[PDB]
């Protein structure tokens, strides 16, 4: 990726996987479940 953020990350020694001391971090950002208005918890499932 020619993005400047990718380059600067590669210049810190990033080699491919997750971050951290042992490379144990998550390799993709997490997703937050969307809340529709004031629907009570669990209403989406049904």
């Amino acid at each position: 990726e020619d993005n400047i953020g990718n380059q600067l990350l590669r210049k810190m020694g990033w080699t491919g996987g997750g971050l951290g001391k042992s490379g144990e971090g998550i390799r993709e950002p997490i997703s937050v479940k969307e809340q529709h208005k004031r629907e009570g918890l669990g209403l989406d499932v049904e």
């Binding site: 020619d2 993005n3 400047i4 953020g5 990718n6 380059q7 600067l8 990350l9 210049k11 810190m12 020694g13 990033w14 997750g18 971050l19 951290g20 001391k21 144990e24 971090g25 998550i26 390799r27 993709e28 950002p29 997490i30 937050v32 479940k33 809340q35 529709h36 208005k37 004031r38 629907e39 009570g40 918890l41 669990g42 209403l43 499932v45 049904e46």
Partner: protein, 665 residues
């Protein structure tokens, strides 16, 4: 052992009668049974973890014991620091501990929050936000002002707390005398232990009564209606005297509920949020008034930060500020709490005696939908400000930095990308002089760059005022029952070019009417927000003087007065621009998010290009605080971001291509 005559060691005078009345009460806190065991660990280990439930007394008593430890050491008297995730917690617990030590708040005991340092040279115990302590480390890498640093409320896993744990783990490898204490309300499977090299653990048993949990038979269609329905059903169908605690997500949701609860019962309501004035906030402690009861409609401030209550209503939601690095969007979001958060809300009912928690969701929704633990804030935050402070601290390698939970690599890319676009980092990742200067401003990197760059546009005075207004709560008072009157008063300050300049008009008129409270009432302006903005502006101006950044204004009689201020906004917020589409919609540049102007804007027309301060993510996407700008300014002021060789080919690039071709004619 040190000689302790029955006098105040800070005044060499006998203690007051109130000191001994408070001393009798806190000696009954469960932590005091473990003072010798706490002392034995503190004098033999550099770091350890202290787990104790809410109400055990860790927050008030443990830092006082560490002051006792510091006073016994020989040499220059260092202080004790105890961090709190919430600025309201730091202020309230500092005033309480100041009473327990019989000293004035701001003297021996003080607090330090962003834009309000209530400490002096006599301060030896300071309750501060975790963000403020990390801020102090930039000018004090080893935090040599403190001999004991206490990270409280570590279970909430705020971004600043996680960074501090990573910084402090590096500091103790270089300072041998520093004591670090990580305090948490839950065990968290010994995660803090393993992180600090299998350090000791001291657990204080909880004194919380049994709590009955009630689940709804089916999911609720509207959790606010269920909350109002449950509040009135507790009031009449319960014979045990008791108070109510309702957890809602934000201020608007609280005032709405307090209004409807009053209307339906009339056929003690106590709000509590962060920006609520402390005069109204202290009403949660006043006694209750057919059984008369107290209902506290609060946010998760009361989940663990403080204690008050036999019945708890848990809708199961909280408001979090999340960041999507894919589309570079940061927004406040209402989201379901964790099973750990739910247990902490239910545990607040079993304080005085056995209580009841009414969870407005089914049992299967609790077990099969709610996560066990809440995501660490570092996994859902914009890291640009944290990365800048770390590089200023001297930490170059953020890949192998020992995070407790490392962030995703894409989130760190966006942080490095942001700082490079602002010229805070060069193309080698090195901190630049401009970046080092930006790190000293307690602002977002976008605001810090905006302030510094405005000096060249000869309008740093006006950007400084706007920056102060953007750093305080909402200045426009808009009562629900008087929207038309409030909006009419707001439009008296409206600038045709948008909301940023409208904030400037409000500040200028506030000053020229001599900070009048009656003037604020007349114009539906929040007096407390404006006094806060005035205080913030003074402090930011003191940072300007330190770096010899000139504070300048353009001639007001000139057309360039408002044009220069709008150009200055682009220096910091060139990445938050939306382009008007042929059919009246707005599309954010690059990221191509479909947005519309927030209804609160003063814009009476839709400019072709708007710069916005805030992304509001509800049912639709709104951009709030918007200013009319010229697209030519975008390509001239921030060409590294508006790079046409790399710009995505949407409709925004088509208009930008014409401008750049016309520039080269």
């Amino acid at each position: 052992h040190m000689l302790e005559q029955c006098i105040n060691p800070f005044t060499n005078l006998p203690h007051t009668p109130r000191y001994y009345d408070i001393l009798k009460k806190r000696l009954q806190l469960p932590v005091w049974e473990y003072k010798d065991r706490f002392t034995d660990i503190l004098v033999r280990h550099q770091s350890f973890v202290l787990v104790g439930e809410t109400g055990s007394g860790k927050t008030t008593q443990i830092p006082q014991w560490c002051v006792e430890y510091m006073r016994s050491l020989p040499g220059p008297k260092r202080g004790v620091a105890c961090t709190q995730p919430r600025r309201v917690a730091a202020m309230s617990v500092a005033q309480r501990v100041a009473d327990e030590m019989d000293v004035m708040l701001g003297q021996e005991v003080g607090y330090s929050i962003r834009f309000e340092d209530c400490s002096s040279a006599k301060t030896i115990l300071k309750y501060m936000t975790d963000g403020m302590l990390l801020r102090e480390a930039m000018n004090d890498p080893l935090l040599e002002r403190y001999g004991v640093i206490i990270l409280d409320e570590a279970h909430e896993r705020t971004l600043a707390t996680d960074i501090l744990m990573g910084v402090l783990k590096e500091v103790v490898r270089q300072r041998s005398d520093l004591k670090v204490i990580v305090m948490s309300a839950t065990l968290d499977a010994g995660k803090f232990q393993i992180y600090f090299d299998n350090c000791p653990l001291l657990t204080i048993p909880g004194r919380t009564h049994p709590v009955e949990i009630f689940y709804t038979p089916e999911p609720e269609r509207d959790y606010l209606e269920a909350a109002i329905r449950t509040v009135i059903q507790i009031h009449m169908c319960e014979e045990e005297e008791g108070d109510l605690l309702l957890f809602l997500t934000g201020q608007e949701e609280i005032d709405e509920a307090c209004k409807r609860i009053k209307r339906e019962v009339d056929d003690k309501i106590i709000p509590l949020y962060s920006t609520l004035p402390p005069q109204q906030q202290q009403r949660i402690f006043e006694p209750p008034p057919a059984i008369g009861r107290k209902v506290v409609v609060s946010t998760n401030i009361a989940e663990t930060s403080l204690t008050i209550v036999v019945f708890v209503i848990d809708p199961g939601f909280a408001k979090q500020k999340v960041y999507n690095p894919r589309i570079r969007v940061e927004s406040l979001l209402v989201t379901a709490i964790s099973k750990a958060s739910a247990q902490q809300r239910a545990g607040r009912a079993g304080r005085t005696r056995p209580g009841k928690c009414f969870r407005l969701y089914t049992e299967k929704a609790y077990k099969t939908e709610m996560q066990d633990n809440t995501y660490p804030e570092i996994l859902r935050s914009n890291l640009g400000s944290v990365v800048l402070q770390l590089k200023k601290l001297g930490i170059d390698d953020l890949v192998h930095f020992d995070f407790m939970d490392p962030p995703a690599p894409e989130t760190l890319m966006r942080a490095l990308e942001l700082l490079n676009y602002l010229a805070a980092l060069n193309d080698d990742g090195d901190l630049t002089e401009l970046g080092s200067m930006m790190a000293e401003f307690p602002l977002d990197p976008q605001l810090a760059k905006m302030v510094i760059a405005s000096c060249d546009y000869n309008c740093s005075n006006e950007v400084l005022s706007i920056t102060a207004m953007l750093s305080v709560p909402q200045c426009f008072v808009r009562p629900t029952e008087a929207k038309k009157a409030a909006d009419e008063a707001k439009m008296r300050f409206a600038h045709i070019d948008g909301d940023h300049l409208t904030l400037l008009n409000v500040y200028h008129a506030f000053k020229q009417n001599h900070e009048s409270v009656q003037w604020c009432y007349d114009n539906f302006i929040n007096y407390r927000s404006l006094m806060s903005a005035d205080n913030v502006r003074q402090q930011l101006s003191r940072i300007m003087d330190r770096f010899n950044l000139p504070r300048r204004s353009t001639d007001f009689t000139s057309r360039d007065y408002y044009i220069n201020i709008r150009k200055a906004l682009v220096t910091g917020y060139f990445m938050q621009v939306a382009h008007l589409e042929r059919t009246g919609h707005y599309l954010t540049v690059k990221d191509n998010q479909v947005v519309q102007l927030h209804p609160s804007t003063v814009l009476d027309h839709k400019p072709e290009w708007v710069l916005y301060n805030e992304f509001v993510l509800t049912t639709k996407n709104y951009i709030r605080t918007c200013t009319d700008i010229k697209p030519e300014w975008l390509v001239k002021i921030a060409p590294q971001y508006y790079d046409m060789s790399n710009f995505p080919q949407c409709e925004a690039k088509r208009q930008l291509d014409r401008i750049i071709a016309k520039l080269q004619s």
